[model samples]
Target: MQDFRPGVYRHYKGDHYLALGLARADETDEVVVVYTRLYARAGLPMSTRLLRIWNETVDTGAGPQPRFAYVGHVTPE
Candidate 1:
């Protein structure tokens, strides 16, 4: 299983994001991923995805790859 570590990740498409952590849905209580966009002029400043979906594989017209591959720990000022 791919561990969802709270840190940085690089999307298969070639953008970076910060995995804030996990959170539970207000109604279903289903686990969800909490993250912030690391790109400019983004659709949403903050976003989330179902735990399973967040770790699922996707194709960026190249081949299959982790939706958000773990990059590494980063320190922000």
Candidate 2:
């Protein structure tokens, strides 16, 4: 099994707007949702919805170094 750690990355858009640590998973089936409060403010009330969007974006934007991906807007669930 692969070993992974829970972490948070911060992305800033000016001052008041910023993105934070948002997800985590273990070698097993264990999973965790990060930044629940940020999601609420962004209008994505459900972890499932936020996760789905994040996953989809990651899958579509896989690349070489320091993989990066994102969704424009996510609706609350």
Candidate 3:
């Protein structure tokens, strides 16, 4: 099963982002999410994180929510 889908997502704090795709770590070969910040970031500084954390939930005033909440798929296929 795919842990993440390539598309947009809304951070827990309300920031928007784009999840490009999944990747495997060079050493441990763990799945990771390659994503970008949609607010500023002129160079389009994309980042990677473990797929576990990508789908992990955290305690919040919203009463626990997925760290990277899914929005929808990218239309530019």
Candidate 4:
């Protein structure tokens, strides 16, 4: 995976998806820092067989520099 933003600094290192955990109550919201070790092949286009939100999200400079992560493996159907 890579940063949702489109630019030269898109794909970062590692294949873990990190994000700020969000919790909403009523109209208020909170952000918690968290990450997940996802699976996918790095530098490879997303599998057409599966639906994906590959590069779509707001970056917050947490971990995985460049605000992007790579996918190194495919999930089983």
Candidate 5:
């Protein structure tokens, strides 16, 4: 997995989020992602675990494989 630093990224589903950076939770370090939901049809929680973003695929009852490709960084406008 490539090193995911603080920046903006686009989800395969077309949602854009910003990765605020890494932080320590208790004793384990974890990454966090913040979604702005600018174009979403419905509102969702603003933050989520970064692992969900970094993983190319997520497990669905049948198996673990679905592309959530990271398109790349988004420059601030």
Candidate 6:
């Protein structure tokens, strides 16, 4: 498994995002991913289960599972 540190990443759809790192849930001690979307409408706050992001599959409720594919670290432009 790759170490997902605080940095930038891209979804399989080519959407880029800046990962701010993991954050604790409001109630449980479960960790979640904190990221901000970039490109087009940018600066949108988003979060997801850390385990899901790190896993090879996600439940999309369409039978077939989805996955989070990281493009690479973002370079300053």
lDDT per residue as tens, model 2, 1-77:
12322233222221111233444455544443354333225566433213433333222233332222233334223
Tell me the spans in candidate 4 whose CA falls farther than 4 Å from its real position: 1-11, 18-20, 23-31, 40-65, 69-77
Cα RMSD for candidates in order: 3.2, 9.9, 3.7, 12.6, 5.2, 4.7
Off by over 4 Å in 6: 46-48, 57-66, 75-77
Better of 1 and 5 by TM-score: 1
In angstroms, give how far residue 21 of model 2 lies from its true place: 11
Runs of candidate 5 exceeding 4 Å displacement: 27-45, 50-53, 58-77
Q: Residue 28 deviation, candidate 2, in Å?
A: 14
lDDT of 6 by residue, 7-74 (tens): 77655555677777777778887777777777766454675666555445655545444455555576
Q: Candidate 1 vs candidate 3: which has greater lDDT? A: 1
Which of the predicted structures, 1 or 3, would earn the higher TM-score when compared with the native? 1
Looking at model 4, how many pairs of residues clash? 9
By lDDT, rank the candidates, best first: 1, 3, 6, 5, 4, 2
Comparing 4 with 6 on TM-score, the higher-scoring candidate is 6
Q: TM-score for each prediction?
A: 0.82, 0.23, 0.81, 0.22, 0.46, 0.58
| lDDT, candidates in the order shown | 0.82, 0.31, 0.80, 0.33, 0.53, 0.63
Worst 10 contiguous positions by lDDT, candidate 6: 58-67
The residue pairs that clash in candidate 2, if any, are: none
State which candidate has the highest TM-score.
Answer: 1
Q: Write the per-residue lDDT of candidate 3 for residues 1-77, one digit (tens) a residue.
A: 25457789888988777888888899998888888887764674788888888788999987989898887864222
Question: What is the clash count of model 1?
Answer: 0
- How many pairs of residues collide in each model? 0, 0, 0, 9, 0, 0
Overall local distance difference test of candidate 6: 0.63
What does candidate 5's lDDT look like per residue over 1-77, in tens digits? 24755566655555666655554444556644444432446556466565555655766555665434444566334
Task: Summarize candidate 1's per-residue lDDT along 26-73 as a digit string, tens digits.
Answer: 898788989987878847789888888988899767878899888787
Per-residue lDDT of model 4, residues 1-77, tens digit only: 23222212223443444343322233434322233334555564321111133333435455334334333333223
- Model 5 worst lDDT run, 10 consecutive residues: 31-40
